[PDB]
Write a protein that binds this DNA or RNA. Sequence first.
DNA 1: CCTGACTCG
DNA 2: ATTCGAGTCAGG
Length: 580
Amino acid sequence: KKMAFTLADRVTEEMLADKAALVVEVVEENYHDAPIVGIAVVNEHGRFFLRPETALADPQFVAWLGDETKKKSMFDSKRAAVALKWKGIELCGVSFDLLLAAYLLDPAQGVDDVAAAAKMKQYEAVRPDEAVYGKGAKRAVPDEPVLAEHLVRKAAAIWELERPFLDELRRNEQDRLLVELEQPLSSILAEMEFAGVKVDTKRLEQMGKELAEQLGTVEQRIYELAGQEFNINSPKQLGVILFEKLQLPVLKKTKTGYSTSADVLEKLAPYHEIVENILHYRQLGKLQSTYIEGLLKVVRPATKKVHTIFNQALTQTGRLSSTEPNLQNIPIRLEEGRKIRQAFVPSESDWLIFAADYSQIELRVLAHIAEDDNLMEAFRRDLDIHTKTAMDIFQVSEDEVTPNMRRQAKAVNYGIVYGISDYGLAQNLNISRKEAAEFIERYFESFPGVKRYMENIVQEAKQKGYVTTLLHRRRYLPDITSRNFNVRSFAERMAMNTPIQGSAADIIKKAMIDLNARLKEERLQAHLLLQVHDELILEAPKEEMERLCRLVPEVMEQAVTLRVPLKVDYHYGSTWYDAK
DNA sequence: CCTGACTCG
DNA sequence: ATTCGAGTCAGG
Ligand SMILES: Nc1ncnc2c1ncn2[C@H]1CC[C@@H](COP(=O)(O)OP(=O)(O)OP(=O)(O)O)O1
Ligand SMILES: OC[C@H]1O[C@@](CO)(O[C@H]2O[C@H](CO)[C@@H](O)[C@H](O)[C@H]2O)[C@@H](O)[C@@H]1O
Ligand SMILES: [Zn+2]
Ligand SMILES: [Zn+2]
């Protein structure tokens, strides 16, 4: 803890070496249009702190920032890249991202600052961010010298930690996972975030008014049915009305009291019609609070765009998440909610929304991985297993399978492969438990390869202490040897699920990198706006739709070669709603 | 601040 | 207790 560094006030030539650790500090969690509070560089010639106003106004520094041949090592380069994009500066030449490296080594660590990454190698010459900026309403940039030393320490850590992290990734066979997948993807995500998605706010505001009226109506119906006014949004007050005043049966309690989950309420529908109204009220209330009001709070008023942040270093399986706002959970399953999507529109005149989605994605992945002949046979024959299972569950013909039953069948197919118990299945479909068990038994009968697989991967997990995906992403499962049934069971189902969802996440990630290449290749103007786990959403000039219809599905289907083909459904239209 | 509700994959 | 992976919100 005694680090020499230059508190510079002008950019020098020795600050612009072709290999360096770089820190461009954004203290605001949401980095969109956020202030950059300081800059630090460590390279073969020394350690430098630069004030942003100086460095960013200097053509020589900016030129360096922009130069691909000049290699930078950073922590969370996407944060830097975007916060720079907002200041009109380009960042290139990022050859190592310590956030992504640490996330690949172990997602459970929840590394979200340099100090946490440093710890993985017992490097302690740097402090946690929170310790320097403080927490909550106390959060503040500290005095220049103190700030300066912190940024410099972070760059020095990055500088020291590159080789050792690359070393361990190399051992794990994750070196290409970092350098060829996560890092390139990071630039693509940065472009998507910066571009944003345009919102029809007049539409959103109109729906909000209508929603408020209907909410008022349902609310009053509920008080009438209840004989009393109460806070329907209080599971606590509600449970009193349901289970104490109306005396409905108690199907379930949690640590806090009576459960009023949708699952429970749906089961109580035979006893009292108030329950259906409550379910409807909470659906509508969510639409209004979150997808009208929340969405309107974060739209940028002059451009009418929303700029999400895709957290690339968060999920245990390798999936992305989306925050502030979450654009991966926009309603679709109920017609009333789905209309929210009419407000998501192209950013240019005469452009349209194109959307492409992997069909049955994880089932295809599992079929490749488990090498089940029946499943792989079902797929080379292009059956729709969701519809099929649906036909089975509701005892109906292909044509009597509504989009809604197909969604139920989907959770059942995935539920079973991912280790749902007879209880959960019976509870899910409100059917008999003995029936549930037999249905499962029958499922494994039908796909014994999948049955062998799930048994094997749990054994493997027990011996190795972790599982892996197609592209060698890894998840550690220490609890898999736990003496506790509950704890151990959770780990075992993680071992069943992670390799498949993680592989699917690997696949779409590679698909995105390839697609970006093929786009820029053919000089198409089309660009990615969103990823939603197994779908990609683009906007593009209407003329391009013809090209896209061949290109996007090809790229997505050929991103990897599996024992079975991949299938991509696609559609386009004037709004996200219409791309169906 | 946590829980339990809703939303999606 | 009892498929898996996420985020946001009101209420408490
Ligand atoms: N209920 C669920 N349980 C576990 N995993 C799920 C569930 N629903 C979705 N997933 C995971 C598995 C499939 C992946 C993509 O979701 P999606 O709704 O597009 O399923 P799918 O690709 O099998 O069906 P579709 O042919 O309609 O696109 O997300
Ligand atoms: O740039 C996102 C990156 O930052 C981390 C921690 O450094 O998370 C921060 O930023 C997120 C996006 O704004 C916030 O949701 C999060 O709460 C905040 O800590 C990483 O988790 C993430 O990869
Ligand atoms: Zn799909
Ligand atoms: Zn999808």
